Design an enzyme around this catalytic site. Structure first.
Site, short mmCIF file in Angstrom:
data_model
loop_
_atom_site.label_atom_id
_atom_site.label_comp_id
_atom_site.label_asym_id
_atom_site.label_seq_id
_atom_site.Cartn_x
_atom_site.Cartn_y
_atom_site.Cartn_z
N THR C 347 0.90 -1.32 0.06
CA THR C 347 -0.12 -0.02 -0.10
C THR C 347 0.88 1.21 0.07
OG1 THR C 347 -0.14 0.13 2.38
CG2 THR C 347 -1.66 -1.27 1.15
N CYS C 348 2.00 1.37 0.95
CA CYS C 348 2.60 2.41 0.83
C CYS C 348 3.71 2.76 -0.26
CB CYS C 348 3.46 2.35 2.28
SG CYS C 348 5.05 1.35 2.12
N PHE C 349 3.79 2.09 -1.37
CA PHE C 349 4.38 2.13 -2.37
C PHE C 349 3.34 1.93 -3.58
CE2 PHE C 349 7.62 1.11 -5.55
CZ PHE C 349 8.88 1.99 -5.08
#
Lengths: 147, 75, 377
Positions: C347-349
């Site tokens: 998600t964070c990428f």
């Protein structure tokens, strides 16, 4: 909460010198700090000093600080941009977690790379498959860049 | 015996278990009573994380022990 | 049902005698290159009776048929103009979780009330003429427009980490070391100033007894008291056309559906603004994936977007300005994963790792199974 808390944390870190991890104010701006980390002794990054830039959002402590690396490192969790995908700064964050806990968590991540979060999946796969090659590459990077 | 588990939302759940009951047994009980898969659930008790292949007596869980529910991994 | 009741509400609202258009036509001329300036010049100098008449809009030096489509494009462009954070009127709640809210810095303008009354007039005109803007605000904003109380849970949509911190403060007792007191620091173009939630609030540290009141004060100050005059002007402009007795028959989501219409996520833009690692469009997996995305329901596509990126709200200008945790990071598809393992998300990428399956149907089955637990919209 955005200045008194910062002053309290700075005073706390100014009392007991860790002698391995240090934090300092960049000039005179309490919302921007520089962190110096000594390489773990029992790690391939032994003897390699590392620099980090820490940004305090104005909503501290309700919003976590942002840490970014500067020195390159052949790690499965630190790309060339110096970003850190650390759970303590996105999920496992509580208002009581001072900045010292963040530095200790980063030190732990350096000691024991976590393959569950492959920021660069290639190096993580190499470590999972070819341990000796991965460690050799990490030590060569530390010798070339950290020194 | 009886133990209590508090979730991240503060919900208190009573589980009728035994000291010799395995961690897998308690995880199965929690899955049956709630529906969460056993692997996702992790129980914190006195700074100890319960792991598969062990028992409650391994973690010194006693009468009316209080446990906390947490998750494992995220991106 | 919910949808049938929504249709009944819309029919009753637009059937009221107080929101009936007239037979006179108002003609407005704007230039496509300069839309915000023309709209502010014209709309902000009309009359309440004038805005209620039939609206006819013609772009300058662009003569064509199907004036309905022309007006729709005009409203789309104007919405993407006034609600642009670069103009410093509405700001994103968080960079990694996109959501528009009234910018506290908008006080820099000598008269922000003028522009915010203009914004209120534009929104009222959009609701009046059954025309859709395409900006997605935060739920506390819609609750404010309907004049509803704001509880703590409302902070969840504004900022996830903020809500988690507040919930932790509420649950566990507060130690004396946590220097938390009734004083909020707000920075407006460099200068950071202290605002007291209660009189002499900067010298009353929180404790076990005070934490409930402190949470109440913080929620009130972050959600309302910050944007007081600006939102008052905006609501005055909005109510200048739509009587409030009509607005207060909806809820925080029916109003959103009335403003933006049935939300959808474009697929062609998604494909044109993605990137690949160890993959290329010549590969069969990529074309299978894009065809499956083409033939999918909007709810399931939103679920997949939330599962991959971590949110269901896109930036203002589509997938182009898609941010991440640190900086810009566009939607990425990678060839990492064993054959049997399910598709994985980061998600964070904004990253999606898809195993190289040997059949399109198998790929769809695995993807659906992996996104089963995700809830969208």
């Amino acid at each position: 909460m955005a200045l008194k808390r910062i002053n309290r944390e700075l005073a706390d870190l100014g009392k007991d010198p860790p002698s391995s991890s240090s934090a300092g104010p960049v000039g005179d701006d309490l919302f921007h700090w520089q962190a110096t980390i000594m390489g773990p002794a029992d790690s391939p990054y032994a003897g390699g000093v590392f620099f980090l830039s820490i940004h305090f959002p104005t909503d501290y402590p309700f919003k976590p600080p942002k840490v970014n690396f500067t020195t390159r490192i052949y790690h499965p969790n630190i790309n060339s941009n110096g970003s850190i995908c650390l759970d303590i700064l996105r999920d496992q964050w509580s208002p009581a977690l001072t900045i010292s806990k963040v530095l200790l968590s980063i030190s732990s991540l350096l000691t024991d790379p976590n393959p569950d979060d492959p920021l660069v999946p290639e190096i993580a796969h190499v470590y999972k498959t070819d341990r000796s090659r991965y460690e050799l590459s990490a030590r060569e990077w530390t010798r070339k860049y950290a020194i | 015996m009886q133990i209590f588990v508090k979730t991240l939302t503060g919900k208190t759940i009573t589980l009728e278990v035994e000291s010799s009951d395995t961690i897998d047994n308690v995880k199965s009980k929690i899955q049956d009573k709630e529906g969460i898969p056993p692997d996702q659930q992790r129980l914190i008790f006195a700074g100890k994380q319960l792991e598969d292949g062990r028992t409650l007596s391994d973690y010194n869980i006693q009468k009316e022990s209080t446990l906390h529910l947490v998750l494992r991994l995220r991106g | 049902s919910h949808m049938d009741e929504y249709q009944r509400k819309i029919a009753y609202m637009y059937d009221r005698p107080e929101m009936a258009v007239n037979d006179a036509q108002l003609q407005l001329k704007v230039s496509r290159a300069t839309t915000f300036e023309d709209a502010y010049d014209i709309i902000s100098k009309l009359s309440v009776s004038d805005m209620k008449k039939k609206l006819l809009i013609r772009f300058r030096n662009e003569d064509g048929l199907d004036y309905g489509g022309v007006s729709r494009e005009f409203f789309y462009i104007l919405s993407h103009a006034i609600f642009n954070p670069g103009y410093s009127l509405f700001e994103y709640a968080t960079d990694d979780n996109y959501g528009l809210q009234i910018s506290p810095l908008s006080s820099v303008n000598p008269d922000f009330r003028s522009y915010f009354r203009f914004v209120g007039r534009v929104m009222g005109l959009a609701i009046y003429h059954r025309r859709y803007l395409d900006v997605q605000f935060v739920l506390p904003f819609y609750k404010r427009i309907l004049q509803k109380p704001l509880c703590l849970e409302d902070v969840k949509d504004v900022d996830e980490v903020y809500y988690e911190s507040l919930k932790w403060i509420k649950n566990n007792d507060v130690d004396e070391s946590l220097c938390l007191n009734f004083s909020v620091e707000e920075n407006r173009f460099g200068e950071s100033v202290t605002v007291d939630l209660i009189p002499n609030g900067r010298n009353i540290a929180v404790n076990n007894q005070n934490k409930m009141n402190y949470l109440k004060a913080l929620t009130e100050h972050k959600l309302v008291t910050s944007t007081e005059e600006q939102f008052n002007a905006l609501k005055g402009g909005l109510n200048e056309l739509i009587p409030d007795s009509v607005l207060q028959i909806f809820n925080e989501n029916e109003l959103d559906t009335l403003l933006n219409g049935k939300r959808d996520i474009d697929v062609q833009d998604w494909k044109r603004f993605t990137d690949y690692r160890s993959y290329t469009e010549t590969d069969d997996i990529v074309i299978w994936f894009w065809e499956l995305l083409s033939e999918w329901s909007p709810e399931k596509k939103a679920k997949l977007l939330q599962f991959a990126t971590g949110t269901s709200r896109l930036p203002l200008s589509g997938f182009k300005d898609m941010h991440g945790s640190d900086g810009p990071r566009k939607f990425t598809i990678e060839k990492v994963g064993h054959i049997s393992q399910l598709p994985k998300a980061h998600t964070c990428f904004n990253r999606l790792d898809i195993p190289p399956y040997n059949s399109k149907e198998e790929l769809e089955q695995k993807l659906t199974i992996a996104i089963q637990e995700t809830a969208g919209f």
